Symmetry: D2
Subunit: 450 residues, 4 copies
């Protein structure tokens, strides 16, 4: 079953029950590429932004109250997720997001028609707007919400789990490893204090990009000049959005031309996500190597079972690879704007929103189902600390580097302890007493735990 | 929702679900992306399980009634009848063990409906490991995507560009180097260049097939083939080749390399990334040639596909070139993810397979679909502004050089300067300056300024 | 021809005139890979750091004044660039930079020997140090100096050149272009205000990474515990470095383990550089397209002649490609640390310092030799503004989008102006007077400058 | 010191146009590499030869160019190319640099040459610079990289053979797995390198395509119609590089650099394989006492300035750092490759720098890795076999004799008492009528399990 709809290019056959109209149906036929459309968070931001625009147009007396009420009601239904099946357009559509903007306009007009209100998708639902300012605004609203309300709390949860282990394992001495080779002692707590700082630095990196990620193009209309919008449209809409979302990070753009010609805020934010992926790869790799074996590996810690494969470190490192790939796609799209508009917005939006979701979800899972339940093999870790030939290092000031190197070489060759080799080489005397040797070779004291 | 009793405890599974306890545990363990295996991956897993059951039956290791049940169930999966029965996230255990168990459980639940009891591990996973099966299904899917879908889509795009190269063989225009006016070319010569880039793309995909088609099946847990028949891999591949017609599928040259690394996926992604680079150039040139109507280059007219703007009435945009360049960006990004996963294998197993499979199979799908749309909805309907193109070519200071031997460097530069000033052709400027005479006839001038001859 | 030197692995033949010793010579033979060694800025930071360590060891009474004076004098000579030919080790060496650290120790010992002072490269010149804290410290000193003293001033120069054009061309009306297609009017000044903001945002992005790029590992020694160093070594050395360089951005690391196990500060900083490269690509591309033709292109502006091919926009876009490549190498190395040490430091250092240098140098050249001298084709730009059928857009509130679309389509088909098509379609009346039509279709007023 | 033409250094063989490019592009401070300069010399000599053959260039002028160009190709004037890599995107500046240096060399021999009219006869920079880039890249692949990879392959294959029976436990997900041999693992690494050589050989049909003869836009205007085929014939005869050919399509050959992007993909895959091989080797060599200690790498230098006697896996570290650089260079190459416009891709100097560096780094590090690391590796045979014989993963073949429950009990006790599975079976008194000592040694034969 089908019905006839029309646009300025002509008549289009639209499925009888569909709430979208002619322009969405053209886009369905023009872009069957990935088979995936906008995400729930994108549809929510478009619905929120359409409702805020109707409210401001109503406040400025440009749109009749009956029409504004119809738009606001329909836009609220869309934002709440009651019509996600009415957004069938592929991500890989026209680069401005024109087709998804018209999808929102057409669906609102159809919802309002059911309520007995006639709205023109362009003249009423899109009053004072363009896709050029609306689609990147909805993208930056979704990205800012993902960063502030989801990713930062997830990272804070992971930071707190790592910090709890840094405290619990403060004196769990082990051998440090540099270049994968036996080094001087460290504590498992000190290593986890390093992982915790990497995550805290990640939170700082996300926060540092919010002044530009939260910049919205709304009000710039077609090219940034604000033509066909009231001069204070942007400031008024952003105030409505801040009041409704509670996201004080949302702001009008510093420059209305930069806000539409470029998507540099998304490139910057993806760089912060890419850095988080890089830190997470190091943390997850160290954790699966510490849990490796038991017989053929390091067997330093035991990971919670979900013979235990390190499944959450594998999920983490796979997510990090995806974030790195997504980051390359975002920068490629970001560089290729032309004149008044960057036309890679739907692709850049897919990738940045995906990177926020993956990092948010895998960070919470890693914290709760892997980090929280880790157990240390305390006796084995102490034995490893004591067996490194590099424990000879604190003797450098007493016997010199060259003699200390001869001690380590001989201890390994003769299968003797460093302490015994120092004694055997006749190094005990005025420069090093037996009591000093024993103080210097104490592995926990050698870790200099705070 | 029905309740299933496992070795650890109790677990609730949706009533209409054909998966069982192990899949439901993986659903609860990995809520990361909310996206599971794609249709092509599910099909390849179904194909592989059917071929394994066939070989276990042939070798007398599996009872014929059990083998027939697996084959019938696996054919339903390969036919795309159960794409809603694979709920596990892409971001799972790196070997793809969870998706391998999902396939075994779904097959057992399908066979149970037919009144045959199957053990997911002992029967459906007989002679197999996930470490050899999941990368095998990935390489089957990738080989099928290359041979049966991408190469024909690129061939369609090549033929559309080559048709324009022929139709516009004599459509002379000015060349552009560094974006500046250059000596004449034809639009057909430019489109012959684009057709060659796509032909080279097909050659690049064909070049990776000897290694993309290598399958790990039979190598079991670490590549040694322990707990599998010694000829399990050769027999399974022979069945797969006979059923699918994919002659590129083969047992791996080295069973350890085939599980420790996924270098064939990295190589194939390189070919897709080069195609994305070529398509970026072709699409960018096309949208620039179609720019306007009055403030751009206006060399060609693209077919109108939809209204261009919600605010600027009557505007129409190059939407298919934009979809092509956005797909290319995605392929470049997917390619970086694939290489990252490929480098980070350890010892006997590379544990980035589900992420690498997602990315390479998506790149194949996006390129296939956008190349066909680009050919059909854009290239096929392009029209050239022939008179405009020839007039610019005939007005170019770049074509004064053949006058030098008749009127001199200084007068040819004066002709070039006046033509630009009066917006006239070089030919009319020569006539206006009264240069036609004994030294230069009108016939000699038209030979010297023959722009189509200059394009060769 | 050669002399014998030794280390804990044995005797090594070293060129007779070379100031380096056994361990540098082993590294010369182990790593002939790229044929390129440390840059002048890296050798300067290593020399500065070695001198600061000797000063603090002397202040704490751990190193005799004669030996400390000899190290400080030799380290100053190295920092000033008097011995760069004595640093022959490849960039692609052991991942901690052990070989370049021993190169600095050995060269200082040889310089001091000429002055009659015997120094042991490990026991004296490397007292309280490790390559694990020294090489990333020297890298982060060089990177912070590159950002603060070179890149930010270069970007400010480019910002000021772009801003000057935004002001000079404030009312130079032209047609906006979206999707490469005719759009509504803009001014050339407005577009350049956009480019200027991209560069200002780039400066903000660099400044935002300085709290972590300026973090130094110095004092953490082998693994971050500070073993074999005084407990306040790092704080004391950083104070000396801040006093000598004037770089208040240099600080002790928040966590000594993170500072050696990872190089996330360099990954973060490279992300800022990559974003600058992305902005520069857009600016340079718009500028070469505006100068394209003349006959076959847009012919909006004239670029200054230097070799007119847009040679500086080509240099800019090539540098941006290199920064994007370098950024991928840096992130790859950054992710692959293990346990107490990330062993990709010499590769990450090469790439980040190169990205800072290329962006600094190409930004100054682009500002001075391209942007400053641009000239606008004012009459042609006005004609372009007036010819876009999208100038029908301000009539949407009077005649509606659908009728405005019919106007644009008819004006293009009949080769008529939008004004004439509105008149011809009989749209003048109560909803639109001729005086309103003329106010709405004025292209400069339409740009809302 | 300085000479005027603009001031040019006295000992410089370049002239005014090169000096202007020096002043115009102070960006990186690095110019053309030796291989690029050589390819430009080869190309200019071959062009002069063909112009002479076709009677377009006087023999005295042609002989002067050929002699000068051979000096450049022989690497006698690598200090005469001062122009930055980051120059005009066509490489016009470096093309003029070559023409001016040739004219200054010929002037010393008493022959006057016009850099443009004689040395650049029948040419454009738009066809010559990418031609010299593809010659250099083809030579780097065929004459240097493939032989270096073959050396590395042969070193890994020698270890695959020497350690054919060195049984050890496999590792999957970093966890204990069924037995393998160190020779089987090294056979996998050798295959990765052999597949790397196949990948490089697969890109040669397109890497070797040359634009020469296409002139400014690919039409061949102002060149003889057979200029390209004649120049390539001379280049192939002189160099022996049979992979060099005229391009399939003259427009694609100048509008795009897709052959460089394809070749960089092959180098990036080699970097990915080398990362896996080098990481496994440094992990197998980890220790001496807190790591895996499966193998011993040859000592190449003292490991630490502070930890005495420590020795590190420096060659694997150089290999993984080169791989990171190749990945980065590959992203820069693809970026440049996509951004051509109409008749010319203007990212050639940047793409050439990156691809030629990737070839050089991979060549040099593969030879060092083979010679200074792989060749001298030693296996800890007894340690490897003891761990394999103590693995719970080898109890599965006991199931048919003693049952799943008793085999798991054997596995649990072996781990508890740090004994082999064999000794644990004997200690639990499982040897009898059901299971003889001969049957037990057949069931627990770890080398047979590795097949």
């Amino acid at each position: 079953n089908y019905r006839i709809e029309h646009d300025t290019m002509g008549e289009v056959r639209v499925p009888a029950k569909a709430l979208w109209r002619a322009q969405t149906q053209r886009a369905v036929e023009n872009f069957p590429i990935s088979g995936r459309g906008l995400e729930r968070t994108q549809i929510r931001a478009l619905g929120l932004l359409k409702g805020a625009c109707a409210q401001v147009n109503s406040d400025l007396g440009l749109l009749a109250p009956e029409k504004a009420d119809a738009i606001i009601a329909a836009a609220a239904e869309i934002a709440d997720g009651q019509h996600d099946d009415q957004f069938p357009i592929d991500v890989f559509q026209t680069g401005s997001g024109t087709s998804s903007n018209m999808n929102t306009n057409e669906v609102i007009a159809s919802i309002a028609a059911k309520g007995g209100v006639t709205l023109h998708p362009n003249d009423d639902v899109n009053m004072s707007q363009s896709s050029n300012d609306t689609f990147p605004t909805a993208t930056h609203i979704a990205a800012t919400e993902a960063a502030v309300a989801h990713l930062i709390p997830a990272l804070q949860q992971l930071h707190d789990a790592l910090a709890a282990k840094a405290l619990d394992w403060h004196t769990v001495v082990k051998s440090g490893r540099t270049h994968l080779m036996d080094a001087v002692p460290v504590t498992l707590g000190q290593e986890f204090s390093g992982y915790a700082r990497q995550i805290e630095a990640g939170i700082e990196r996300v926060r540092a990009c919010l002044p530009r990620l939260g910049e919205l193009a709304i009000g710039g209309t077609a090219v940034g000049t604000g033509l066909n919008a009231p001069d204070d449209f942007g400031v008024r809409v952003v105030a409505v959005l801040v009041a409704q979302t509670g996201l004080s990070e949302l702001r009008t753009a510093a420059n209305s031309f930069e806000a539409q010609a470029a998507r540099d805020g998304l490139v910057e934010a993806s760089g912060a996500l890419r850095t988080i992926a890089v830190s997470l790869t190091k943390i997850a790799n160290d954790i699966r190597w510490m849990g490796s074996g038991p017989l053929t590996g390091l067997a330093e810690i035991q990971l919670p079972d979900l013979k235990v494969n390190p499944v959450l470190p594998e999920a983490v490192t796979q997510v990090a690879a995806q974030v790195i790939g997504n980051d390359a796609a975002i920068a490629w799209g970001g560089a290729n704007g032309a004149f008044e508009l960057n036309v890679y917005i739907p692709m850049m939006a897919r990738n940045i929103l995906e990177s926020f979701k993956l990092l948010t979800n895998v960070s919470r899972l890693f914290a709760q189902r892997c980090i929280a339940g880790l157990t240390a093999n305390v006796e084995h870790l102490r034995r490893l600390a004591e067996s490194s030939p590099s424990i000879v290092t604190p003797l450098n000031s007493a016997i010199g580097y060259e003699e200390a190197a001869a001690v380590a070489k001989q201890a390994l060759k003769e299968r003797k302890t460093i302490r015994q080799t120092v004694i055997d080489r006749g190094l005990i005397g005025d420069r090093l007493s037996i009591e000093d040797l024993d103080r210097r070779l104490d592995v926990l004291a050698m870790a200099k735990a705070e």
